[PDB]
Design an enzyme around this catalytic site. Sequence first.
Site, mmCIF file in Angstrom:
data_model
loop_
_atom_site.group_PDB
_atom_site.id
_atom_site.type_symbol
_atom_site.label_atom_id
_atom_site.label_comp_id
_atom_site.label_asym_id
_atom_site.label_seq_id
_atom_site.Cartn_x
_atom_site.Cartn_y
_atom_site.Cartn_z
ATOM 1 N N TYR A 186 0.848 -1.158 -0.091
ATOM 2 C CA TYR A 186 -0.043 -0.099 -0.116
ATOM 3 C C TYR A 186 0.948 1.314 0.104
ATOM 4 O O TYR A 186 1.709 1.293 0.809
ATOM 5 C CB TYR A 186 -0.874 -0.229 1.393
ATOM 6 C CG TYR A 186 -2.182 0.623 1.482
ATOM 7 C CD1 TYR A 186 -3.180 0.261 0.424
ATOM 8 C CD2 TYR A 186 -2.271 1.605 2.401
ATOM 9 C CE1 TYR A 186 -4.257 1.095 0.792
ATOM 10 C CE2 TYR A 186 -3.462 2.436 2.322
ATOM 11 C CZ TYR A 186 -4.563 2.147 1.631
ATOM 12 O OH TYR A 186 -5.636 2.770 1.576
ATOM 13 N N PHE A 199 -12.154 5.197 -6.640
ATOM 14 C CA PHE A 199 -12.515 5.747 -4.971
ATOM 15 C C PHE A 199 -11.587 5.264 -4.066
ATOM 16 O O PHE A 199 -11.223 4.061 -4.085
ATOM 17 C CB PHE A 199 -13.986 5.278 -4.598
ATOM 18 C CG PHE A 199 -14.250 6.020 -3.296
ATOM 19 C CD1 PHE A 199 -15.239 7.109 -3.159
ATOM 20 C CD2 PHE A 199 -13.916 5.328 -1.876
ATOM 21 C CE1 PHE A 199 -15.628 7.621 -2.161
ATOM 22 C CE2 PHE A 199 -14.231 5.961 -0.844
ATOM 23 C CZ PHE A 199 -14.991 7.306 -0.760
#
Lengths: 364, 364
Positions: free
Chosen positions: B57, B299
Amino acid sequence: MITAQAVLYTQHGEPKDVLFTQSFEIDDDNLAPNEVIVKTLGSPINPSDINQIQGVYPSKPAKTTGFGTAEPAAPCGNEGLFEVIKVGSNVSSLEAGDWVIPSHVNFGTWRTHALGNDDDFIKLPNPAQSKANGKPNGLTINQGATISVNPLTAYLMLTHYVKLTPGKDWFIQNGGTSAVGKYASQIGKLLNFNSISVIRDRPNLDEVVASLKELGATQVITEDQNNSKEFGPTIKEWIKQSGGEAKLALNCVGGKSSTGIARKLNNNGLMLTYGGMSFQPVTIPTSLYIFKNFTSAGFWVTELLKNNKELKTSTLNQIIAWYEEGKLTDAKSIETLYDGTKPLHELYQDGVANSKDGKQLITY
Amino acid sequence: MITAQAVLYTQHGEPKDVLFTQSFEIDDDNLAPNEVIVKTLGSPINPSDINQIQGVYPSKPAKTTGFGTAEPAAPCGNEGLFEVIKVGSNVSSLEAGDWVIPSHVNFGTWRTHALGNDDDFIKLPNPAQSKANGKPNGLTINQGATISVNPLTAYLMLTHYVKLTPGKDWFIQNGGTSAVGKYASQIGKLLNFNSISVIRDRPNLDEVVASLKELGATQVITEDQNNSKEFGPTIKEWIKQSGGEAKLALNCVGGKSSTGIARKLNNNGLMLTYGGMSFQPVTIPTSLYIFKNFTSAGFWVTELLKNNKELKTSTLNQIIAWYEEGKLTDAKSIETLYDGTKPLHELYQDGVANSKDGKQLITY
Ligand SMILES: NC(=O)c1ccc[n+]([C@@H]2O[C@H](COP(=O)([O-])OP(=O)(O)OC[C@H]3O[C@@H](n4cnc5c(N)ncnc54)[C@H](OP(=O)(O)O)[C@@H]3O)[C@@H](O)[C@H]2O)c1
């Protein structure tokens, strides 16, 4: 009276199978006040024209008996250049000798003549009018016949969606040897946008690279290079050296090609899909959407310009001006002339079958 | 002086390999203006928490020696509920007893205490404050601890992009049994949005379907049904019957699944992609972009809310009000108390190993 010919079909299918020629009469001695009769000069064969005949294109002329067929039939072709030959008593916007294109889609341009209202057409300057207005060039028949779709598509994709900073930002497009692709490269040059064209490999790859570069492509790569992890850092170097960003991708291919051009954008990128080869879907890695604020959307000039005469007008006027000024050029069509010795529908069937040779323009 | 514990890692890898517990000291008398000391009440384990630990991430807290470690070390957890126990001279927004969540990601919520600035936190009402404002209930630790991400994502995806007409319009989502999925179904029901959840088939289908419909999914379908051209018209009937349209698709799966949910939208639809199950790119038919005015975007709650605290707090205020107005049900976590029975990092290590049983909440 005028005995005209129209290319029609009573059932959807492949152009090679379902097209025929229908003789029909236009009474040029019986024009209503706002009516106009035109003679076709030329009309191209575009993929959308073919998709319409095949029955897979959701915008199409109605089947009627209006051409004097027993069964309901539809005409073909959406784009074309016509010469006004006669006008009704209340027509002021057009005169005999004027050049016009259809004002709307689904007019049926694969035919010798049409009867319509004055507002079914948009006037273009004919060569005599361009010359009288002090312009160094007038439009050719091919330029006028193909002005309605491809040039406008390139211009609007480039200017209506994201603002590229002149002298630094980039767009990337696939289908680089397409008519739209070639207009986009030129418009990029004219507006000082940097660009990468992605093309398929071919025997004369190096010669095509050089032609696209002359049109305005900054760099041209193959689809192999688009796919390539090894090659990717070279593209990043180009963008970083320019001081700008890749903000816009134009996609007419789909599949892996679409993935590759999307991966080449900087953050906040926008892709516009305006076409699609081989029914391959638009395929975008999830990470670009989530972590790079990527957006993927569509472009369809028919729909954008449906209720927007002003944008259409302003765009068409810029293309016309550029042709007159000698600043824009069309790709050379292969022209087949209709003289009445071979049925008109067969000229169009040949043109469909010979699509791969180049853009086909039937002239009159 | 407060003696505290934190779950750390000196380097990236799997939680079973790299996590350890570090005791460190918070000076609660050597303070500063605008400073706030908090005790943790509860923090969940989310996939993103694990993705930071793994080093995949691209958004994560920095590696400092500030917890008293020999080598640089990063804390764990982005979500948590805390209680304020002490504030600095110039802190008016917060008071001892108050509940708070972190203002921003990368806080490190897998630990017993923290010292941050008052801008580092957002106030939630504690149960006694809610009840003193005449509310039937106050938030439970699970509700506050888990409020910041999943309910916000769902609320935001459903309300911040397109406006669904109440009692009429539909959204569609895959990953129907996901945590977000389950909130979206609920929020959909509260806002009176009709919804379709897509889930994979299984032997206990009937039970999973019932559970999702109880949460507020109007319709639940399998991915096989999502894949089915035959079933398409049945979905169209549902939407017509409600006098509405499917305007929004929420994709967390990718591949075929993303293709199927996109196809179910009416013209002018939006897809938001907020996740991506295993390797699969977002795959959308060209025809949707060109002919149906379809848009596909991303998103990411973090990026959306980075510099938008007015939007973040406004959304929280509604989740909070529904909470313990008794109108929203949390997803029900499996809690394990940090009670000294086992070291703190082993608690988190077990919840990661036990992710499949359900949402894991460590309480304090
Ligand atoms: N949505 C809209 O507003 C709209 C408007 C205009 C055009 N379009 C789209 O744009 C395309 C045609 O425009 P055009 O008139 O410029 O056509 P064109 O001049 O005939 O060019 C067609 C292009 O497609 C490429 N191509 C063909 N098969 C391919 C494949 N399998 N993989 C990758 N590329 C392939 C060709 O490459 P080669 O030179 O190597 O053969 C060429 O670049 C169509 O997809 C059409 O639907 C859409």
